[PDB]
Amino acid sequence: QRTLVLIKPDAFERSLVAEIMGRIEKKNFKIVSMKFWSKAPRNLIEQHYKEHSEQSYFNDLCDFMVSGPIISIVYEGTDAISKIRRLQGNTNPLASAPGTIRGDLANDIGENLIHASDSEDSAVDEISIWFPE
Amino acid sequence: QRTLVLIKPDAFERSLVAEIMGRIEKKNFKIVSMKFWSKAPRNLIEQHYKEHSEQSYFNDLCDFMVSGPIISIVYEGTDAISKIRRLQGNTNPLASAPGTIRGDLANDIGENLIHASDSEDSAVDEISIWFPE
Amino acid sequence: QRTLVLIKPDAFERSLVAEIMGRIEKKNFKIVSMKFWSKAPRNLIEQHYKEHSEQSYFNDLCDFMVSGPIISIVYEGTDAISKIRRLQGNTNPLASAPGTIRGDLANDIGENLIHASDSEDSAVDEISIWFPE
Amino acid sequence: LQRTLVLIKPDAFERSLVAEIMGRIEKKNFKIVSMKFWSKAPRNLIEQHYKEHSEQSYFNDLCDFMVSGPIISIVYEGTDAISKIRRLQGNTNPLASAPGTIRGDLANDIGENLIHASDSEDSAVDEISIWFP
Amino acid sequence: LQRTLVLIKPDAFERSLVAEIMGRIEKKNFKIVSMKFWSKAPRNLIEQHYKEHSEQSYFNDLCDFMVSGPIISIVYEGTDAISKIRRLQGNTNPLASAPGTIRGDLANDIGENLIHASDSEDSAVDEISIWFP
Amino acid sequence: LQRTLVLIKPDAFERSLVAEIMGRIEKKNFKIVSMKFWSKAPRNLIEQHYKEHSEQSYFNDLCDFMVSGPIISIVYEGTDAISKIRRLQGNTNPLASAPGTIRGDLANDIGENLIHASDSEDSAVDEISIWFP
Ligand SMILES: Nc1ccn([C@@H]2O[C@H](COP(=O)(O)OP(=O)(O)O)[C@@H](O)[C@H]2O)c(=O)n1
Ligand SMILES: Nc1ccn([C@@H]2O[C@H](COP(=O)(O)OP(=O)(O)O)[C@@H](O)[C@H]2O)c(=O)n1
Ligand SMILES: Nc1ccn([C@@H]2O[C@H](COP(=O)(O)OP(=O)(O)O)[C@@H](O)[C@H]2O)c(=O)n1
Ligand SMILES: Nc1ccn([C@@H]2O[C@H](COP(=O)(O)OP(=O)(O)O)[C@@H](O)[C@H]2O)c(=O)n1
Ligand SMILES: Nc1ccn([C@@H]2O[C@H](COP(=O)(O)OP(=O)(O)O)[C@@H](O)[C@H]2O)c(=O)n1
Ligand SMILES: Nc1ccn([C@@H]2O[C@H](COP(=O)(O)OP(=O)(O)O)[C@@H](O)[C@H]2O)c(=O)n1
Ligand SMILES: [Mg+2]
Ligand SMILES: [Mg+2]
Ligand SMILES: [Mg+2]
Ligand SMILES: [Mg+2]
Ligand SMILES: [Mg+2]
Ligand SMILES: [Mg+2]
């Protein structure tokens, strides 16, 4: 499987980019594609998060995602989608488990360091958004 | 919220002080106050652990807590009390989860490296004990 | 208690030997005996895994275990058997928890870095296999 | 303020040291301003990158190595980035690279040495225009 | 056996490197004998600390920086603590600090350089009496 | 390609630095070819190991220290293993061992200095035949 991961602007701000990538790297997942964005276009962000367009946090979320750089990465591995989701940790700081990326490093439900596709369907979708080629 | 954390004498003995503080630091909690005690007065210890005065381990616990230095720290952050408790890990070595401080580092129910307040009520209480000002 | 741990050939291949040993070392378990095997004899491997002789993976498993070096280690500590099992993590990569050795480092149900005895009975047994003296 | 061109070499991918190397540069507070992942760099880019070495005995082996796995090309930005990152990198020769340097700690071969860093202002501008034209 | 005075500078807090720096000194087996957290050090303590620099061009900027965030003052104890910790610290100038040193690995500015360490026996005694009178 | 003899000294066990030290050599890509755990090395092996020092003032204290806890004897293999691992090791004198070296980062005593490494081809062959006859 291939999954789409984003390193979010807060990781750059907090100098955690290598930390997060290294956790996935140490689990033996392989980078298939990678793009550095000094600032992602808002439209890309809005597409990526289209399922959230009616949520009260939608605009703050979009602002945050264009507030700094992003790295988009396609990772490949057996069951990569579910596995990276478990490494990522829960969105909520009251739930993300110590040992996960978010459990160890993130303290906010919004600024939470990392995106990972949550299903095969959304992976295909998100990979096409960030890597249309 | 603010929570009271103690680095216990075993952390000093095992050179784990930075390791433990760094875990909390990496989760983005801010130090509000901090005190180094070369040896905490026994009365302080007894006050801190007053709810345990009738337990069979009470005296050994007090002896341990004055057996070496302690750092008392007030940490501040959203939901800091519950969050630091989860990072800390369960008291019992048969239960504390890998990824938590105790799960990774502690092997004894007594010498377990770190105290953290378990509720808002006890936080206020413990902060007043270690930082009466 | 004493438990038998094997560092498997994949750990050597991936340069993870110190990483894994260090996790157990940091939990304060003591090495009682240790043997380095440039290649374990197949018969030893087959004895170690005798309960799996009827599984479809038995032969591939034996081939893997002689494909590179192994370190056998006897660790000692209170409840060392169950504790090291929890640090190890589940066999299945879909289940092993971030924070465990396998959850963090292993991505395959076969090549999973580390063996640890699962009970007192099997510990005694496995210790006698690797350390017959 | 300067920009320098870094390549993460194919041995870094093979040995799972990508984040380790990027992390050392990150902790030194250098900022990524461009980055491209190459599953396999074109021979000609490599030969152009090392055009100074084209008549050297090791040229063909060097170019072969450089196309034997993925690379990442990165432009780093910071005050005196060029000399400072050269210092982090360490000497080409494993007999001379100091512990604490990337190569001193991690590399054990004069050829397979994990990282390229531009060695001057002029070469930085040249290399940057090769990888990011 | 000697005592030396270390300050963790405000940039360390900003960049979440407090435990990282303390940890390097801890792993070298130096013992904390005094420690005080300052949410903001008094200007006058800072000016007294750096009184030697009072006529230097950078004095006002230095003092401003030093009161721009928290600091920790620490007295470390050990055999030849003064010269040894100075060695860990690394050169003031980022063009000269060796990789493997605190500043060589972590600092990228001559001013914002993370840590102060007493540079001699006499200055150690002076500085210790400033921060711990 | 060379082989060198390393001893992990009893202070490494006491301070839980076994994996830390082995890990530095591992990351440098040196391969273990022999390894033996000694819960307590025989006095005579130690005295033979250091026979060059037999008339030195520190000999008895050195031998006493060396039998005061476990040691691991390891034969490492790699290109120029002898000089390269000596470089990792760092100077005997804590006034001289460079940060980034094993001793520079970790050791704070001329006697208790964590690791032995053969210092030449001839001494490597001698020491290897002592520990692995
Ligand atoms: N209550 C919420 C939920 C999500 N969000 C943001 O929206 C993104 C997550 O929506 P999601 O439910 O798909 O969460 P993840 O898959 O990112 O865990 C998060 O990563 C947050 O940045 C938020 O700011 N507040
Ligand atoms: N069975 C027990 C329970 C607690 N204790 C000690 O008493 C303190 C804990 O009591 P507690 O139930 O408040 O535990 P924590 O909040 O520290 O996890 C522990 O940190 C131990 O040092 C003990 O020695 N034996
Ligand atoms: N479905 C399976 C189950 C086990 N195995 C192998 O057989 C060994 C495990 O059998 P086990 O159930 O005793 O697992 P652990 O105790 O090693 O977790 C594993 O470590 C794998 O190397 C496998 O290759 N495929
Ligand atoms: N004697 C040599 C010199 C360089 N080389 C290789 O080709 C590159 C030589 O470039 P260089 O001399 O500019 O060394 P660096 O600047 O990469 O340290 C090195 O990175 C090695 O990969 C080699 O294989 N043998
Ligand atoms: N040229 C300089 C020299 C020092 N400084 C600052 O003021 C302090 C100078 O003290 P120093 O020369 O005793 O340097 P260290 O002993 O801190 O390495 C440094 O830590 C810098 O923060 C500066 O900003 N510019
Ligand atoms: N002045 C000295 C020199 C060495 N020694 C000890 O004995 C060994 C001396 O051997 P050496 O001079 O060959 O030093 P290394 O090669 O171990 O760095 C050291 O590892 C110290 O443990 C000492 O205690 N005092
Ligand atoms: Mg989602
Ligand atoms: Mg409690
Ligand atoms: Mg089993
Ligand atoms: Mg060059
Ligand atoms: Mg100074
Ligand atoms: Mg010697």
Cα(A12)–Cα(A18) distance, rounded to whole angstroms?
Answer: 9
- Contact status, residue A3 vs residue A116, Cβ threshold 8 Å: yes
Q: Indicate the resolution in Å.
A: 1.9
E101 contacts D30? CB cut-off 8 A: no
Contact B120, B27 (CB under 8 A): no
Question: How would you label F78-106 residue by residue, b for 16+ Cβ within 10 Å and e otherwise?
Answer: beebbebbbbbbbbeebeebbbbbbbbbb
E102 lines ligand 5 (CB under 6 A): no
Distance from C-alpha of A55 to C-alpha of A60, rounded to nearest angstrom = 10
**What is the Cα–Cα distance from B70 to B5, expressed in whole angstroms?**
10
Protein residues with C-beta less than 5 angstroms from the ion ligand 8: B 118
Which residues have CB under 8 Å from F64's CB, separation 6+?
none
Q: Which of F71, F63, F25, F72 is nearest to F44 (CA)?
A: F63
HSE-CB of C58 using CA atoms within 13 angstroms:
12
Distance CA F71, CA E12 (A): 38
Longest CA span, chain B: 39
3-state class (DSSP) for residue C86: helix
E-assigned strand segments in C77-124:
114-116
C-alpha to C-alpha distance for F4 and F118, rounded to whole angstroms: 6
Q: What are phi and psi of F32, to 5 degrees?
A: -70, 130
| Backbone phi and psi for residue C111, each to the nearest 5 degrees, phi listed first | -80, 95
Q: Give catalytic residue positions of A.
A: 115
Instruction: Characterize E71-87 residue by residue with b for buried, 16 or more Cβ atoms within 10 angstroms of its Cβ, and e for exposed.
Output: bbbbbbebeebbebbbb
Return all residues near E91 (Cβ < 8 A) that are at least 6 apart. E97, E98, E101, E103, E104
Helix (H) or strand (E) holding A14: none
**CA angle at residue F16 from F12 to F19, to 5 degrees?**
80
> Residues of F with catalytic annotation?
116
**∠ Cα F31 F35 F39 (to 5°):** 145
Measured at the alpha carbon of residue E102, what is the angle toward residues E100 and E105, in degrees to the nearest 5?
Answer: 60
Identify whether the C-beta of residue B4 lies closer than 8 Å to the C-beta of residue B73.
yes
- The pair of three-digit structure tokens given for residue E30, joined into one six-digit string: 């130096």
Distance B17 CA to ligand 2 centre (A): 19
Q: What's the token pair of residue D82? A: 């060029």
Locus of tokens 């250091």: F50
Contacts of residue C28, defined as CB under 8 A and 6 or more positions apart, other chains included, come to B14, B105, B106, B107, C77, F16
> What is the rounded distance in angstroms from the CA atom of residue C22 to the CA atom of residue F22?
9
Question: Between chain E and chain F, are at least 3 CB pairs below 8 A?
Answer: yes
Residue B46: both structure tokens together: 């007894």
E116 C-alpha to ligand 11 centroid (Å): 7
DSSP state of A111: S
The yes-or-no reply on F/D contact (3 CB pairs or more, < 8 Å) is yes
Rounded to 5 degrees, what angle do the CA atoms D42, D43, D49 make?
A: 95
CA dihedral (D66, D67, D71, D74) in degrees, to 10, reads 70
CA pair distance E39, D84, nearest whole angstrom: 32
Domain ranges of chain E: 1-133
Taking the CA of D127 as reference, the closest ligand is 10
Ligand 2, CB cutoff 6 Å, lining residues: B 52, 57, 61, 91, 109-110, 112, 115, 118
Contacts for D70 with CB less than 8 Å, ≥ 6 apart:
A31, D10, D13, D37, D38, D39, D40
Topology annotation, domain C1-133:
Alpha-Beta Plaits (3.30.70)
**Contact: F15, E29; criterion CB under 8 Å:** yes
Cα-only R_g, chain F? 14
Among E21, E91, E108, the residue to mutate for chain D (most D Cβ within 10 A): E108
- In degrees and rounded to multiples of 5, residue A70 shows phi and psi of -140, 145
Q: Which residues contact F25 (CB under 8 A, 6 or more apart)?
A: F6, F76, F85, F88
Going F105 to D106 to A106 to A84, the CA torsion angle's sign is: negative
Enumerate residues 6+ apart whose C-beta is below 8 A from C106.
A27, A28, C10, C89, C93, C96, C112, C113
Quote the DSSP letter at residue C60.
H
DSSP string, B71-124: EEEEEESTTHHHHHHHHH--SSTTTPPBTBHHHHH---SSS-SEEE--SHHHHH
Instruction: Take residue D23 and report the two structure tokens written for it.
Output: 């992390």
Cβ D68 under 6 angstroms from ligand 4: no
Closest C-alpha residue for ligand 2 atom 24: B110
Grouping H, G, I as helix, E, B as strand and the rest as coil, residue F61 is helix
Tokens 């994949």 belong to residue? C10
Angstrom distance (rounded) from CA E115 to CA E23: 13
* CA-based R_g, chain B, Å: 14
Query: Is B6 in a helix, a strand, or coil?
Result: strand
- Using CB atoms within 10 Å of the CB of residue E33, give its burial: 0 to 12 exposed, 13 to 18 middle, 19+ buried: middle
Please state the three-class secondary structure of chain D as a single string.
CEEEEEEECHHHHHCCCHHHHHHHHHHCCCEEEEEEEECCCCHHHHHHHCHHHCCCCCHHHHHHHHCCCCEEEEEEEECCHHHHHHHHHCCCCCCCCCECEHHHHHCCCCCCCCEEECCCHHHHHHHHHHHCC
Cross-sheet strand order for the sheet of B70-76: B114-116, B2-7, B70-76, B30-37, E31-38, E71-78, E2-8, E115-117
Chains that touch F (3 or more CB pairs under 8 A): B, C, D, E
- Helix or strand holding residue A31 (H, E): strand A30-37
Q: Residue written as tokens 């289940």?
A: C95
Q: Which residues pair with D94 in a beta bridge?
A: none
Q: Which two tokens stand for residue D57?
A: 């005995």
As annotated, the active-site residues of C are 115
Determined by X-ray
Cβ–ligand 3 contact at C91 (below 6 Å): yes
Two tokens at C120? 């007192």
3-state secondary structure E78-127: ECCHHHHHHHHHCCCCCCCCCECEHHHHHCCCCCCCCEEECCCHHHHHHH
- Ligand 4 pocket: which of D85, D92, D95 to mutate (most atoms <8 Å of CB)? D92
Is the minimum distance from the CB of D102 to ligand 4 under 6 angstroms?
Answer: no
C-beta atoms surrounding A4 within 10 Å: 25
- CA–CA distance, B71 with E89 (Å, rounded to integer): 24
- Residues at the binding site of B are 8, 57, 85, 102, 112
Is the beta carbon of D70 within 6 A of some atom in ligand 4?
A: no
Which residue matches tokens 């095992």?
A: B14
Distance CA D93, CA D77 (A): 26
Separation CA B85–CA F68 (nearest Å): 39
| Separation between Cα atoms, residue A105 and residue C98, nearest integer Å | 13
Q: Which of D95, D110, D126 to mutate to test the pocket of ligand 4 (most atoms within 8 A of CB)?
A: D110
Chain E residues within an 8 Å CB radius of B133: none
Token pair in block for residue E50: 């750096």
Kindly provide the residue ranges of all beta strands, DSSP E only, lying in chain F, ordered along the sequence.
2-8, 31-38, 71-78, 115-117
Proximal ligand: closest to the CA of D60:
4
Given a contact cutoff of 8 angstroms between Cβ atoms, the answer to whether F35 and C71 are in contact is yes
Residue E8 to residue E20: CA distance in whole angstroms: 11
Is the Cα torsion angle F108, F111, F112, F118 positive or negative in sign? positive
F8, burial (CB in 10 Å: exposed 0-12, middle 13-18, buried 19+): buried
CA dihedral C33, C38, C43, C49 (to 10 degrees): 60
Q: Order across the sheet with C2-7: list the strands.
A: C114-116, C2-7, C70-76, C30-37, F31-38, F71-78, F2-8, F115-117
No. of helices (H) and no. of strands (E), chain B:
7, 4
Closest residue by Cα to residue E85 from E95, E94, E75: E75
B112 Cβ partners below 8 Å, 6+ apart? B8, B10, B91, B93, B102, B106
Cα E17 to middle of ligand 8, angstroms: 29
Q: Whose CA is nearest to atom 21 of ligand 5?
A: E111
Nearest by Cα to A46 from A64, A34, A72, A29: A64
Cβ–ligand 1 contact at A115 (below 6 Å):
yes
